A paper describes a structure:
Influenza virus genome encapsidation is essential for the formation of a helical viral ribonucleoprotein (vRNP) complex composed of nucleoproteins (NP), the trimeric polymerase, and the viral genome. Within each vRNP, the viral RNA (vRNA) segment is encapsidated by the viral [name] (NP) and attached to the heterotrimeric RNA-dependent RNA polymerase. In this study, we established a biological tool, the RNP-like particles assembled from recombinant [name] virus NP and synthetic RNA, and we present the first subnanometric cryo–electron microscopy structure of the helical NP-RNA complex (8.7 to 5.3 Å). The RNP-like particles are a tool that mimics the influenza nucleocapsid.
The helical RNP-like structure reveals a parallel double-stranded conformation, allowing the visualization of NP-NP and NP-RNA interactions. Each asymmetric unit (NP monomer) is related by a rise of 24.3 Å and a twist of 57.4°, resulting in a right-handed parallel double-stranded helical reconstruction with approximately 6.3-NP protomers per helix turn. Combined with the AFM data, these results confirm that our RNP-like particles are assembled as a right-handed helix. We were able to visualize a parallel double-stranded helical assembly at a resolution sufficiently high to describe the conformational changes of NP to accommodate RNA binding and oligomerization into nucleocapsid. It is important to point out that our helical reconstruction is straight and does not fully reflect the highly flexible nature and the inherent dynamic of our ribonucleoprotein-like particles and so the vRNP. We did not observe interstrand interactions that would be relevant for vRNP coherence. To propose a picture even closer to that of a vRNP, we generated the antiparallel RNP-like conformation by flipping one strand by 180° around an axis perpendicular to the helical axis without any steric clashes.
Numbering used by the authors:
A (entry chain A), B (entry chain A): 21 to 490
Amino acid sequence: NATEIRASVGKMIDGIGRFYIQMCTELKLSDYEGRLIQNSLTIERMVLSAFDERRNKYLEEHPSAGKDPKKTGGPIYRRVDGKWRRELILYDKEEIRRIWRQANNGDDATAGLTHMMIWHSNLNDATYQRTRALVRTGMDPRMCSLMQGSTLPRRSGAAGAAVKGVGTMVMELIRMIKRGINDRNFWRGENGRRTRIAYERMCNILKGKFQTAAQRTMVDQVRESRNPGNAEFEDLIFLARSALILRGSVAHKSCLPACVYGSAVASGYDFEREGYSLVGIDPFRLLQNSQVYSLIRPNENPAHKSQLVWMACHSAAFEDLRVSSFIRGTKVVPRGKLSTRGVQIASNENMETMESSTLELRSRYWAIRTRSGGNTNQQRASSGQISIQPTFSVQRNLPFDRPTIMAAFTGNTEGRTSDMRTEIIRLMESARPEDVSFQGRGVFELSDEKATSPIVPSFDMSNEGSYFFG
Amino acid sequence: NATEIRASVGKMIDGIGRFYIQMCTELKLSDYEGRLIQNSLTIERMVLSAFDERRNKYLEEHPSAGKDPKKTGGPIYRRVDGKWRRELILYDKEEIRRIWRQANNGDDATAGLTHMMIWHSNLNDATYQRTRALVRTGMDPRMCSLMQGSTLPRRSGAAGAAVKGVGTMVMELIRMIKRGINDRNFWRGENGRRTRIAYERMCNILKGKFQTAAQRTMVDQVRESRNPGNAEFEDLIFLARSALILRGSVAHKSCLPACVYGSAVASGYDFEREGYSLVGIDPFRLLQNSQVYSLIRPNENPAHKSQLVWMACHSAAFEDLRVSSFIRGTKVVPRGKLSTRGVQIASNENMETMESSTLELRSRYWAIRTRSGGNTNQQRASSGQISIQPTFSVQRNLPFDRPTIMAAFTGNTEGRTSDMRTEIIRLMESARPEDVSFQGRGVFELSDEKATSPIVPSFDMSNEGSYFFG
RNA sequence: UCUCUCUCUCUC
RNA sequence: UCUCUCUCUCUC
RNA sequence: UCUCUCUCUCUC
């Protein structure tokens, strides 16, 4: 059944929206002030800090960073008769914790929290990619397209586990491997137990994310090493390099800024009644009638800023430029020639140069974001029955496709990773960059509500460049 | 997190400084005497001898060199009413070992020891380059710029492993190869095991230091030889010759003399509270308000001595003269016309000719010393994505950059070193001596604390000579 | 080398 | 990820 | 699945 999940997501988004309304009430902000991305970012990171129990518990035992008992940050921006001002106002954790407490009818709202962490992951992935950590681990910065949800902490649950990508998991595993190489953390203490439990859980998440059998079995053989040394390091690097083409269907949750949700909730559009979806038309239908303001530097182009924020909202920073432009309706500028900077504003930059303006979010078309992979993998490995069932009682043979039956079982168990690298490189060679994917699907029009008739895109515009980076 | 490392380095430097204060207390030296480079050198080499367990353990079984149970050296210089005197005072190992024992709150202070070895490496590299060992190994003395940390012993840890350079590792590997050629040390005894363990660890350090993939794979194929004969000898020589241009980002730790640290600690500038950094502005900000005295021969120019000691402190002996002068503010004299000698003073030279004077260390500007390489390598091999991730569930192809996918994996494994020498010489030909490096970075002013605005240097002063040697 | 291996971000 | 990993079905 | 999982029988 899908009605229950729809009601649950509608309920928790209604809670988030009415929390945002409560914030707009308590901050004494004007109508325009509540349509700002920056203040939503500030309050939302404040919520992240308040609800992150582990960092807090690390902090009350560590009274450092000067003024840090329980209050952090808070750069609220207010419009003064056309000009702008920034104030560093500090808020307690317990008060706003309880404001959430009645902002969700007595619940913890963990799903909402995961929504905020995921929307932060999308903003960071859209703005800045961490080539720095990649090169730190020795890992090639050519594969930044594997950095989905890198800024996410491990505190996120299964819903948060859905969005964090393959390459980010390679990075976090490499971090723990380097730590275990530096010192003997693998002893029989409770620390070793929690490390191996986390390691096996993360490997299970990995094997869930992949699609082809060969990579799944190689990963299953990865955690056989009770004492991970150096071989699994290049094993995981090659895992990422092979997942370049055999990508895992991780997630692309379409999280939206708190201002848009709050404006919708304030207008009386209760999400529980008509339902809410995070994947279909629904996150789209709020945006063509949404007004968003933000601050811009006197050199930044607002036209680029609108495209970038729509990227971040729809987590399309790692999507191809051609289809993103087709859905948007206008050409999208790659990261190479963007005359803009990060949407976050520095704490030291001067107050005079900021100017507020409206953000354009309307898009001509819409499409469903499925958590799947390209059809090319199913082209490499076709589909069909392998077994048969006797319906009539007739004296006949039972046809069994035996050579694939051994392949599923792997009768002769794989010796090491290398034998798997062999046929996975063979599959990579079988791959082609002209393999059309997602057959039977298309882009629909905004007037469509039940996905009745799509239109297939056709891109013949030479080599404009399907690479947002470079 | 960077606060913990900052606190740790501040703590161990505070320990070193208060050890230096304890030494100034116990030596009964005057105020000027503690501002001398020579006495700091003597006590510091004494500490090196006391804390070097391997040489000690080689020595108590070898009672040679006459008076050598546990006491070595100690040429302390004292000012007598304007004149100078030198005394050979001998100190025990255990007493000063325990003085360190409470000089660091009960710790071994291995990081501090590594700091002293690295600062010795910088002094030796600044003063004298070992062309002698290069020619001994048959290795061309044109490449002395690869002699970073040559005097370092193998006892230094990972922090010490960071600073010892590529050419020095070529030299130590050549030494072990010559030893294994002379006699069959590669037998199945425990000695062979420790040799191969050290050899593979040092090769791992090498492959960590390099940047380009081709050299890394060639090095990975280097240790495939279970019995190293003669081919890997020219293989490593060519490795150094290729690393001439494709240099490895080894390290340039800015270690400072114990007198400067001790003066700062005595004044009450506790490093733990405000933090310490070895790489940023911090090692610089102590020096413009630091007073240093040293002995000089009646022919040596003190102006050259100040520049040389600032070179040694900042380990800029292998940096280009133009930028070093720009940061210093005054022209730097190359090794060709330096009317000075080594900062260490001979044990046989007469007492009458020594004269003490102040050392100039103040510099107009400051810059960050990153452990990176020139941008020219990234110009030869550009940057960008290689793989893509499906965000929307659309029937579409997954574009994979296959020809580089084989290149990362090396599907057809390299036959020997020669096929790699081919394209590495091709890359050397692609190299140009006009490739501007370190884009997006610059030199900042001393008034800057957060690296807000740099100024890019522009050198058009013909051919003054960017070669400290020759 | 988490005081910056490149596309730039105060954000640890 | 039950708003679609492929053969297409409004059927939850 | 008593309209036949093997040695064959209309026998219920």
